[PDB]
Design an enzyme around this catalytic site. Structure first.
Site: not given
Ligand SMILES: [K+]
Ligand SMILES: [K+]
Ligand SMILES: [K+]
Ligand SMILES: [K+]
Ligand SMILES: [K+]
Ligand SMILES: [K+]
Ligand SMILES: [K+]
Ligand SMILES: [K+]
Lengths: 308, 306, 306, 308
Positions: A49, A113, A139, A144, A167, A208
């Site tokens: 990202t 999404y 992740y 997000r 992560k 991270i």
């Protein structure tokens, strides 16, 4: 492999420098990579990202991996961002990134999404783990992606031989749990700079990081303190670290980190739309707060990658 | 254009039927479509979320647009999903779609994953609306994409002469404000089948629906009751429709809608990974609740890599 | 005073034992208390939330303060719950408590139900701290009362020379900021047993605990590991403590803690309505998880109206 | 009884006027009560949140009920706020309010602060419904109390003969459900002014209102439109109504409504701590937005009820 990554504490999520022009600035890459290895970056995550991966082309990600592996020339291990919210596109890119080489692991985000169920995510990551020589790090980030893997699904996956870590950006309760039940050869990274202190105390492997671009030393300093058992120094750094983390995310990231990296002389340049750079007025407050620089200021435009 | 869509009340967010092997079931499209136009679909949105657009390739989307347009033959206006979270790709695709022709508009979602600021969202949508002949409808759905357009940024965009409306999934408070301040030639759709009663009551132009696949008739009856000022009847319909919408979204869409469509003979097929079909015990619940049907681990599929 | 509490690490939020008929079980208090002081309770908070204070009358609270003080005999400092959501009542009660004597402080919760603004919260807490000899600890817990003191208002209050700390239940981000900017003679407790590891790590003064009733020992071992810079051991303890805290709060507190205390012989009794005891199937889960005990509809009780 | 309340559409949640002095202004009560019955108040709720009930004494609530029943002299039905988060105190006050008389129903909020379970709430309201001649209306409002009754618990209660309704402030999905499954002689009121439009369209009985103090006419106008089937007028009023509702709650209520009632000449006076009056700068914006008055303005203090 898990082995390449095992000793990592500060994995940086490397930005993608761009010109006023929208094209990638491969020129600015060498100086940025040096700065990171000079400021305690243990490992580099490419095309995540923070790299504005949604706006990098297929061929641009391939350029980036070559350009960074040339300039790192083996010095720290590397992770490539491989997952999208399409399982087939993720199977294809990772098998491709296995071929390409130079990576210790592929990172794969919980699909954004389309909001899959837990079984959906399970079958997703299984397929990507199945697909390639490159092992996978998941992740998990509902902040997000809306949805998240529960610890139970996540530990189901952790048993896959080719899934070597996570992560995690959920809660410290969740993180505690994962560290407590992890199988072997499975690595737990926070993806939250503002929690890294707590995650490390709890027995996480590392961070991270975004803040590692501009505050890698003080982050090293805090982690050493945890490891060398000086909790008073570690917490003192943490308490002053939190408002820096907040400024680095006070406009959509990587805008604030690029603006600081721009003040520091690294030409990170602007962001590709739909991200726009930080407003000037925020830009000064941010540099002040994060690196205690003074920004002598002078409406704000995001850029598109060349039509040609 | 705005003209083309002015009259639509029920624009359906059309599924993409898939074969058990994960290729598009192109054979199922004519029957499914006729069924929509038979059940008060006034307009169709192709390759939206319900089409599993994240899983359709560039060419597949184009081939769906062919199939559907061939069947539709101009009976209703069409909307193509064109936006993604990359502004350049969205520009290049809205051009290719404008070029393709036969679309009254392109739908562009607020960017997912990268969480742009309002100003970033404005530059994004401006560039898409600047790119092409094809007019733009914004899709605002923070339940899918985290961030949202405030009404204020939305109304700035409403002024672009090539942006002609919004599929709005935020709150009724926002939807009221947008209806109230909307400029000319700007359509306001709800994207929330559950709230369509309230949205139409509040003065919306209609609904961009999943439910219309399976429950077009009662949606038609409600909108008709509403426009005929028969509220007791509109609300009787709404009160019983809520659980069916609930059921439709009780495993992640479009699993529940394909499971019902399969049960009705339509060969919707399964979903493409990362989405998996509705589990068995759930499928029965869902049919019983949504269509009153009597029905009886789950496997999501991949697009062929050959 | 601040002096009195400077040293407390584990201040326990003491239950109120009730009889099956709903009167206070005053007989159970001596055994329960000795058990706390036996298990690393350094300080006790009487008539907090865990005491079911909403259900204790004015006189009952006073009679608890007697019983407990008689047993305690100055072995540890004491904290009285004094605040409610009415500013006048809180003033009148902190005076009566200061007068009563034997309390190092009074705890005043951020007002519940009426949702005051920050400025309202400042005037509230200022007036309470102005009222009496007795120093004030603020309780900030938006998970119970909806609104919260921002750190900024909190630090304004921290300056009142009669406000000597906070039981803070917001976020670790807030708790860090408060530790960082705290003035002199201002104690920072976490009120969240789950986050006590993190809070102590971050530089808190300790925990105002429910868990300490049943798990004082391992909490003591963790805080000791923490202060002896034995992190691997602190965190081993924390990782296994989380589910026990979870279990303790898995039916509304203090149901789960009374069910464990009952199982350990202590006659905690049931809860006063509107709270009901933990359901049966749950009681067994809870004992097994929290104390590793082997155990085996539910009825909340009313205070006598005679 | 349910019968007294059945035809009500606009139940006002009456404020408690206070002097600069903190004592109740029983003098200002007559004019306020008249204004409400002049502006389409169907029924009055006494000693609710809007009345700052948390700060009214036992004896002050009793003064208020006498003072309002004298001045209403039978003209509209009345509801007394009786519940607290203590079931015994709620049993005692309601049996007492049954004795006192003049009330069509007692209103009882889901307990705040102690956060009971569904069984807890069930046994709570059962006990209060059991206790007295006065039937009960439940006020479900997680926005003030954190927890909420689920529709299933709520409909369990609705079957009690002495539970005649609910002032519901959750979601319109929940409200739809309650209207759909209600038993007979059970009334559904929204307690959200900004939803009243939608709640009425869905088949609710009415609103228990704050905005009715200062915008009772336009609220009447919108409701008549729904009833007389003019949806275009109803929605036009609704669209302009929403920003007024938001201003009335833009500072902790009843501060904004008192400040408007103060401009209108009704001496609502200030609020009792822990509430403070609205800041001057908000006070002008609010009067402008809600009643299109112009406030010629001139740090802000909440008051305590006399120590003596
Ligand atoms: K990319
Ligand atoms: K593994
Ligand atoms: K696609
Ligand atoms: K337009
Ligand atoms: K009490
Ligand atoms: K102080
Ligand atoms: K009261
Ligand atoms: K009833």
């Amino acid at each position: 492999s898990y082995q390449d990554l095992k000793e990592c504490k500060i994995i940086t999520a490397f930005i993608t420098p761009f010109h006023e022009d929208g094209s990638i600035n491969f020129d600015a890459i060498p100086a940025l990579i040096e700065h990171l290895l000079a400021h305690h970056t243990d490992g580099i995550l490419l095309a995540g990202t923070t790299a504005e991966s949604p706006t990098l082309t297929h061929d641009e990600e391939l350029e980036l991996f070559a350009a960074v592996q040339k300039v790192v020339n083996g010095r720290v291990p590397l992770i490539a961002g491989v997952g999208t919210n399409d399982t087939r596109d993720s199977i294809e890119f990772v098998k491709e990134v296995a071929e390409f080489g130079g990576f210790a692991a592929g990172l794969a985000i919980v699909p954004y999404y389309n909001k899959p169920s837990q079984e959906g995510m399970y079958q997703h990551f299984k397929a990507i783990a199945d697909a390639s020589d490159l092992p996978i790090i998941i992740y998990n980030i509902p902040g997000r992606v809306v949805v998240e893997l529960t610890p139970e699904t996540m530990l189901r996956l952790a048993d896959h031989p080719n899934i070597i870590g996570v992560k995690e950006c959920t809660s410290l309760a969740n993180m505690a749990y994962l560290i407590e039940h992890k199988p072997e050869e499975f690595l737990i990274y926070t993806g939250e700079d503002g929690d890294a202190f707590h995650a490390m105390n709890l027995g996480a492997d590392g961070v991270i990081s975004v803040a590692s671009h501009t505050n890698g030393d003080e982050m090293h300093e805090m982690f050493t303190a945890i490891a060398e058992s000086d909790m008073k120094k570690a917490a003192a750094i943490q308490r002053k670290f939190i408002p820096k983390v907040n400024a680095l995310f006070s406009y959509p990231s990587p805008a604030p980190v690029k603006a600081i990296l721009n003040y520091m002389g690294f030409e990170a340049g602007p962001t590709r739309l739909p991200l726009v750079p930080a407003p000037e007025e925020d830009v000064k407050r941010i540099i002040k707060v994060v690196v205690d620089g003074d920004y002598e200021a002078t409406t704000v435009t995001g850029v598109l990658r060349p039509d040609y």
